[PDB]
Structure 1
Amino acid sequence: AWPKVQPEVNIGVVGHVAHGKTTLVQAITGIWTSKHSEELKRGMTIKLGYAETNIGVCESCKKPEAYVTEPSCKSCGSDDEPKFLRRISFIDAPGHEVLMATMLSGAALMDGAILVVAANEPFPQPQTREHFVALGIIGVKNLIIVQNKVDVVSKEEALSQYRQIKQFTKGTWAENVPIIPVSALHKINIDSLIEGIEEYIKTPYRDLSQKPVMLVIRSFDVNKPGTQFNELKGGVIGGSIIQGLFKVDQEIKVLPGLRVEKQGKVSYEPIFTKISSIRFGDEEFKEAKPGGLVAIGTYLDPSLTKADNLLGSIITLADAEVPVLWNIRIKYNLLERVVGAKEMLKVDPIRAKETLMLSVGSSTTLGIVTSVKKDEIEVELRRPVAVWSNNIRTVISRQIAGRWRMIGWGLVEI
């Protein structure tokens, strides 16, 4: 048997709408990540999807068939148990152009990524480009490009697009990233992709002694009908631990906290609570480390956590010092053009009084520009943000023709 452990790495799955991201995750994990009503109705990912799998290798078999996702080597002709390598997880992003803020929020949780490119669609589609650019900006450079749907193109067509893709990455940070052809739908060459994941998306070094920080992407009321008449189960908060570690019974706080009234004005009150339970997937643990999306059980009134109320928050230890800022200063750079549009228009300089959208960690916030300089802006936010380190990446978006468009990035200065 394989050990039961948390995932140790998060692999993003990104790319243009319907190119096959969710089907790819299903091919690897057996899981269909879409679980919301609207997602099932539209056949499209809307919220961040999530799935885990164990990875092992059959030492008696040849690669890539030696790589397996369950404790059996029967697939490559061996009765031996495969050697366990690690448990991995996938962050399945929405690829729709209007959902970029959600993709960006998930990118903050990625240790590496797969860019899925459909072989039977013109290359490069708008969100093939946009997600590629966003990965580079956020620094998710451990990338595999997957050429999907090769089952419905000729070999000649596949090779032609392959050349296209290599030329696209030529002269970029991604010049040497591998391109792996698969059919997610028919599970062809998935073993090569597993081998690729092991080679190119290694588990990164972690800093377990740094102040614990979890970025929140979900929060739940897990109380359900038909269960016993005791007091309500506490609110559950979901996200990814980006540094340090958390343990059951630890005093924690949620930042910025709860929107409340104080002295006639809107304020944010840090939410203090204690960790009651820790879960990854269907399994409980006594502590939680970077890697995987974790469910932190708390003693909070479920009304405080219901329906992703705490999305964009962070969790730290109760006594930790973390800046919570209503006004931020960003050392920024602008992209040359708007890559996510079907026609790439030039990016205009940032002007004072503009309302911009800021992606910081898992949070997405609107604010007004109060000051513009050559490499520096100041922004008055509609809601404060937790800034847990001195040089955190932010992505800057502007509303252009009714859509939020990524136009730049920078560092939040504290």
Structure 2
Amino acid sequence: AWPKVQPEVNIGVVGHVDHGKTTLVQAITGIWTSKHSEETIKLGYAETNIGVCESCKKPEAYVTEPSCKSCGSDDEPKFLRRISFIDAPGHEVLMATMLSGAALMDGAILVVAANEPFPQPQTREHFVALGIIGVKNLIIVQNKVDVVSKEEALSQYRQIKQFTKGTWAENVPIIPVSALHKINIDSLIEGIEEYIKTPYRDLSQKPVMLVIRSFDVNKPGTQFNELKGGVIGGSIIQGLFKVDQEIKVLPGLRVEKQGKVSYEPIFTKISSIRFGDEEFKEAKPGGLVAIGTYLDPSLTKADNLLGSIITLADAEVPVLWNIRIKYNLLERVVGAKEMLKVDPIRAKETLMLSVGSSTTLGIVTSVKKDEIEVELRRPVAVWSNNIRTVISRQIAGRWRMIGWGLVEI
């Protein structure tokens, strides 16, 4: 038998909308992401086990369920790992969610339609977005190869391989498939194993989890004495959490008093840990977890806590209202139909910073070549110095990434 274990890695599936992201995840997992249930946790999210048939031949040997029959064995295949997929379906340019999901990803798949000319505009943007959020274990999937000749396909392979020449993606593998008719889906599973390894985990590190959702899971009609603590859900970036640990939510609760706004950490205990509809006793990185608490539900209702981080109660985690960022910029942003150039940061101009799952707004109080300082509209929990942030500006009525950087403390 295969063990029931949580997902150990997140892989984001992204690409120009309509190019087949949602279908591809379904080909692999057997689940359809928009929408799914339930659950809640939004986005697209789907998990699958991944296994190998030792007797049989690769790629065909790879399997997402515990049977080797397809290669001729009644033998049980070797369990490799459980993985999860996160894809943001539908409307794009809407992503402060690409930034949330950004910090969840241990690697990505960029879906490229084969019956359409490459790069499309949203396809170039996603390729830069990926560099900015610094997720570099990347497989490029050439989808819909079934609608075009081996030849039209190799042509696009040429174009893609060329377009990544000189880039950090120069050696990123390109895998042809049909998500809709399920062709060569095994080559892809092989590639995922080869090109997106579960990262080193250090379990001694201080537990930290980004909150991407919060619910009140009590159904209407629920008797008061049967009520359930608020549920927070999100993904653990480091350390591990255990049922019954004491934890706190940062920045936490927000106070008026009555004209001067501050933030108080929110303290509570972990009542339960769920991955999918599986309960567990611990939560490590990878996958999206649902943490039950002893919190008054009105605290977690309707994603109130979105953007928070969760640490253990006695953890030491600065909450700052001003931050120093060592930053790089892009020379040009894809912009309108034409390439656009980014002005250097100017004093007092307001910016959008994504830290972890937080998207928070700030006014730039100092600017130099490699560093800037911003006054934040809302404080951010900085759980370490390595923390990557994504600077974005207001360009044409819509917020758009102009570069990235490291928060310094």
Scaled to the shorter chain, the TM-score interval is over 0.9
Q: Who is 1:349 aligned against?
A: 344
CA distance in 2, matches of 1:341, 1:131: 15
| Higher mean displacement: 124-133 or 3-12 | 124-133
**1:250-284 deviation digits (Å, cap 9, x = unpaired):** 00001000122235311111000000000001100
**1:38-62 deviation digits (Å, cap 9, x = unpaired):** 99xxxxx995221110010111111
Shift of 1:369: 1.2
Q: 1:61 to 1:36 in 2, by over 3 A?
A: closer
Shift of 1:77: 2.2
Pick the aligned partner of 1:144 from 136, 139, 147: 139
Q: 1:251 to 1:38 in 2, by over 3 A?
A: closer
Q: 1:303 to 1:209 in 2, by over 3 A?
A: same
Q: 1:15 to 1:340 in 2, by over 3 A?
A: farther
Shift of 1:402: 1.2
Identity %: 100
CA distance in 2, matches of 1:48, 1:341: 26
Q: Who is 1:8 aligned against?
A: 8
Q: 1:46 to 1:232 in 2, by over 3 A?
A: closer
CA distance in 2, matches of 1:391, 1:4: 33
Q: 1:38 to 1:50 in 2, by over 3 A?
A: closer
- Residue pair 2:9, 2:287 contacting (<8 A) in 1 also: yes
Give secondary structure in 2 for the equivalent of 1:97: coil
- Residue pair 2:41, 2:213 contacting (<8 A) in 1 also: no
Give secondary structure in 2 for the equivalent of 1:258: strand
- Residue pair 2:51, 2:77 contacting (<8 A) in 1 also: yes
CA distance in 1, matches of 2:196, 2:285: 15
Q: Who is 1:373 aligned against?
A: 368
- Residue pair 2:22, 2:89 contacting (<8 A) in 1 also: no
Shift of 1:75: 2.0
Shift of 1:35: 2.8
Q: 1:112 to 1:274 in 2, by over 3 A?
A: same
**1:331-356 deviation digits (Å, cap 9, x = unpaired):** 11110111254321111111112111
Shift of 1:304: 0.8
| Higher mean displacement: 27-36 or 93-102 | 93-102
**1:11-44 deviation digits (Å, cap 9, x = unpaired):** 11111111111111111111111238999xxxxx
Shift of 1:96: 4.1
| Higher mean displacement: 301-310 or 171-180 | 301-310
**1:259-315 deviation digits (Å, cap 9, x = unpaired):** 222353111110000000000011000011111111111011111111211111100
**1:115-173 deviation digits (Å, cap 9, x = unpaired):** 11111222112232222222222221111000111122222221111111101111011
Q: 1:335 to 1:46 in 2, by over 3 A?
A: farther
CA distance in 2, matches of 1:36, 1:101: 21
Q: 1:65 to 1:36 in 2, by over 3 A?
A: closer
Give secondary structure in 2 for the equivalent of 1:276: strand
- Residue pair 1:109, 1:242 contacting (<8 A) in 2 also: yes
- Residue pair 1:120, 1:149 contacting (<8 A) in 2 also: yes
CA distance in 2, matches of 1:59, 1:317: 42
Q: Who is 2:290 aligned against?
A: 295
CA distance in 2, matches of 1:15, 1:399: 23
Q: 1:238 to 1:180 in 2, by over 3 A?
A: same
Q: 1:380 to 1:275 in 2, by over 3 A?
A: same
Give secondary structure in 2 for the equivalent of 1:277: strand
CA distance in 1, matches of 2:224, 2:90: 42
- Displacement over 4 Å in runs of 4+: 36-39, 226-229
**1:165-209 deviation digits (Å, cap 9, x = unpaired):** 101111011111100001111111111100111111111100100
- Residue pair 1:46, 1:94 contacting (<8 A) in 2 also: no
| Higher mean displacement: 366-375 or 316-325 | 366-375
Shift of 1:79: 1.1
CA distance in 2, matches of 1:303, 1:28: 37
- Residue pair 1:127, 1:340 contacting (<8 A) in 2 also: no
Shift of 1:93: 2.5
Provide the aligned length of Structure 1 versus Structure 2.
Answer: 409
CA distance in 2, matches of 1:332, 1:126: 26
- Residue pair 2:218, 2:227 contacting (<8 A) in 1 also: yes
Give secondary structure in 2 for the equivalent of 1:37: coil
Q: 1:144 to 1:312 in 2, by over 3 A?
A: same
Give secondary structure in 1 for the equivalent of 2:35: coil
TM-score (norm: length of structure 2): 0.96
Please report the RMSD computed on the Cα atoms of aligned residues, expressed in angstroms: 2.1
**1:354-404 deviation digits (Å, cap 9, x = unpaired):** 111111111111111122212211111111111111121111111111111
**1:205-249 deviation digits (Å, cap 9, x = unpaired):** 001001110011111111124656633111111111111100000
Pairing 1:306–2:301 present: yes
CA distance in 2, matches of 1:218, 1:340: 30
- Residue pair 2:34, 2:89 contacting (<8 A) in 1 also: no
Q: 1:242 to 1:37 in 2, by over 3 A?
A: closer
CA distance in 2, matches of 1:76, 1:344: 50
- Residue pair 1:46, 1:99 contacting (<8 A) in 2 also: no
- Residue pair 1:313, 1:363 contacting (<8 A) in 2 also: yes
CA distance in 2, matches of 1:30, 1:227: 33
| Higher mean displacement: 270-279 or 28-37 | 28-37
TM-score (norm: length of structure 1): 0.95
Give secondary structure in 1 for the equivalent of 2:93: helix
CA distance in 2, matches of 1:381, 1:344: 30
Pick the aligned partner of 1:50 from 45, 48, 57: 45
CA distance in 2, matches of 1:130, 1:46: 26
- Residue pair 2:218, 2:228 contacting (<8 A) in 1 also: yes
Q: 1:192 to 1:36 in 2, by over 3 A?
A: closer
Q: 1:216 to 1:46 in 2, by over 3 A?
A: closer
CA distance in 2, matches of 1:359, 1:264: 27
CA distance in 2, matches of 1:412, 1:137: 14
CA distance in 1, matches of 2:169, 2:58: 25
